[PDB]
Short mmCIF file of C-alpha atoms in Angstrom, two decimals:
data_model
loop_
_atom_site.label_atom_id
_atom_site.label_comp_id
_atom_site.label_asym_id
_atom_site.label_seq_id
_atom_site.Cartn_x
_atom_site.Cartn_y
_atom_site.Cartn_z
CA UNK A 1 0.00 0.00 0.00
CA UNK A 2 0.94 3.68 0.22
CA UNK A 3 3.97 4.10 2.49
CA UNK A 4 3.80 6.48 5.46
CA UNK A 5 6.41 8.76 3.77
CA UNK A 6 4.36 8.92 0.55
CA UNK A 7 1.17 9.60 2.53
CA UNK A 8 2.96 12.44 4.35
CA UNK A 9 3.86 14.03 0.99
CA UNK A 10 0.29 13.72 -0.33
CA UNK A 11 -1.32 15.04 2.86
CA UNK A 12 1.08 17.81 3.78
CA UNK A 13 3.18 19.12 0.89
CA UNK A 14 2.28 22.08 -1.31
CA UNK A 15 5.45 23.11 -3.11
CA UNK A 16 3.63 24.78 -5.99
CA UNK A 17 2.19 27.84 -4.22
CA UNK A 18 3.98 30.15 -1.77
CA UNK A 19 0.81 30.40 0.34
CA UNK A 20 -2.96 29.89 0.35
CA UNK A 21 -4.24 32.54 -2.10
CA UNK A 22 -7.94 32.46 -1.19
CA UNK A 23 -10.29 31.37 1.58
CA UNK A 24 -11.27 28.50 -0.78
CA UNK A 25 -7.78 26.96 -0.76
CA UNK A 26 -8.60 24.25 1.75
CA UNK A 27 -11.84 23.13 0.12
CA UNK A 28 -9.98 22.62 -3.12
CA UNK A 29 -6.74 21.11 -1.71
CA UNK A 30 -8.47 18.66 0.62
CA UNK A 31 -10.29 17.23 -2.42
CA UNK A 32 -7.26 17.40 -4.78
CA UNK A 33 -5.20 15.35 -2.30
CA UNK A 34 -8.02 12.85 -1.76
CA UNK A 35 -8.70 13.68 1.87
CA UNK A 36 -12.52 13.77 1.55
CA UNK A 37 -13.28 10.53 -0.30
CA UNK A 38 -15.40 8.65 2.23
CA UNK A 39 -15.05 11.06 5.11
CA UNK A 40 -14.02 14.68 5.48
CA UNK A 41 -10.59 14.63 7.16
CA UNK A 42 -11.33 17.12 9.98
CA UNK A 43 -7.98 18.85 10.28
CA UNK A 44 -4.93 19.08 8.09
CA UNK A 45 -1.88 21.26 7.48
CA UNK A 46 -0.18 22.03 4.16
CA UNK A 47 3.43 23.25 4.04
CA UNK A 48 4.35 25.71 1.25
CA UNK A 49 8.03 24.81 0.92
CA UNK A 50 10.10 22.47 -1.25
CA UNK A 51 10.04 18.76 -0.36
CA UNK A 52 13.78 19.01 0.29
CA UNK A 53 13.23 21.74 2.92
CA UNK A 54 10.62 19.70 4.76
CA UNK A 55 12.66 16.49 4.55
CA UNK A 56 15.68 18.34 5.99
CA UNK A 57 13.73 18.92 9.22
CA UNK A 58 14.53 15.28 10.12
CA UNK A 59 18.11 16.38 10.89
CA UNK A 60 17.19 19.61 12.67
CA UNK A 61 15.96 20.00 16.27
CA UNK A 62 15.16 16.71 17.98
CA UNK A 63 12.23 17.40 20.33
CA UNK A 64 9.99 15.25 22.50
CA UNK A 65 7.01 13.57 20.86
CA UNK A 66 3.53 13.63 22.44
CA UNK A 67 3.59 9.84 22.16
CA UNK A 68 6.94 9.57 23.93
CA UNK A 69 8.90 8.31 20.91
CA UNK A 70 12.28 9.86 20.19
CA UNK A 71 11.73 10.57 16.47
CA UNK A 72 10.15 14.07 16.46
CA UNK A 73 11.92 17.05 14.94
CA UNK A 74 11.17 20.77 14.92
CA UNK A 75 12.30 22.95 12.01
CA UNK A 76 14.87 25.62 12.91
CA UNK A 77 13.00 28.09 10.69
CA UNK A 78 9.42 29.12 10.28
CA UNK A 79 7.75 27.89 7.10
CA UNK A 80 4.71 29.10 5.17
CA UNK A 81 1.82 26.89 6.21
CA UNK A 82 -1.93 26.66 5.76
CA UNK A 83 -4.13 25.11 8.46
CA UNK A 84 -7.37 23.53 7.24
CA UNK A 85 -10.16 22.72 9.68
CA UNK A 86 -13.58 21.39 8.75
CA UNK A 87 -16.42 23.77 9.66
CA UNK A 88 -18.95 22.74 12.31
CA UNK A 89 -21.68 22.43 9.68
CA UNK A 90 -19.65 20.64 6.96
CA UNK A 91 -20.80 17.27 5.55
CA UNK A 92 -20.17 14.92 2.60
CA UNK A 93 -19.73 15.04 -0.30
CA UNK A 94 -19.08 18.80 -0.24
CA UNK A 95 -16.69 19.07 2.70
CA UNK A 96 -16.26 22.68 3.88
CA UNK A 97 -13.11 24.06 5.52
CA UNK A 98 -11.74 27.17 7.20
CA UNK A 99 -8.40 28.27 5.72
CA UNK A 100 -5.71 29.90 7.93
CA UNK A 101 -2.36 31.07 6.51
CA UNK A 102 0.64 31.59 8.82
CA UNK A 103 4.42 31.24 9.17
CA UNK A 104 5.40 28.78 11.85
CA UNK A 105 7.93 26.10 12.73
CA UNK A 106 6.73 22.59 11.95
CA UNK A 107 7.18 19.47 14.09
CA UNK A 108 7.23 16.11 12.31
CA UNK A 109 7.99 12.46 13.19
CA UNK A 110 10.70 10.85 11.03
CA UNK A 111 11.45 7.22 10.14
CA UNK A 112 13.13 4.96 7.62
CA UNK A 113 16.09 4.99 5.29
CA UNK A 114 16.12 7.54 3.98
CA UNK A 115 15.10 9.09 7.33
CA UNK A 116 12.11 11.20 6.22
CA UNK A 117 8.83 12.68 7.58
CA UNK A 118 6.10 10.09 8.24
CA UNK A 119 3.73 12.18 10.40
CA UNK A 120 2.93 15.88 10.82
CA UNK A 121 2.57 16.54 14.54
CA UNK A 122 2.15 20.30 15.00
CA UNK A 123 3.23 23.79 13.96
CA UNK A 124 4.62 26.33 16.47
#
């Protein structure tokens, strides 16, 4: 099946735009990345940076994970990110989301060889 690293790319990477350009960004992106097929994924974050920049975070600041594992890393720099959160009234098939653009550090869990992001934990 889809590997955790590949799923991370599909769910969290947006290297083609420097930032969310409209309030409709999330509605469109959540569908384009197949996150509303049989259920509206309630919350998601997209990172507007190159894949290389996000992958590099795995060798940046090692920080504690919520789950106690030792594989979480925080980026040294802020990155352009868009937070997407399903509205309280949203429902299939037309999932509705609130779009929020900001510049924050990201925290991801890394695994494998190559040692790359497999889960997006939070943005600070």
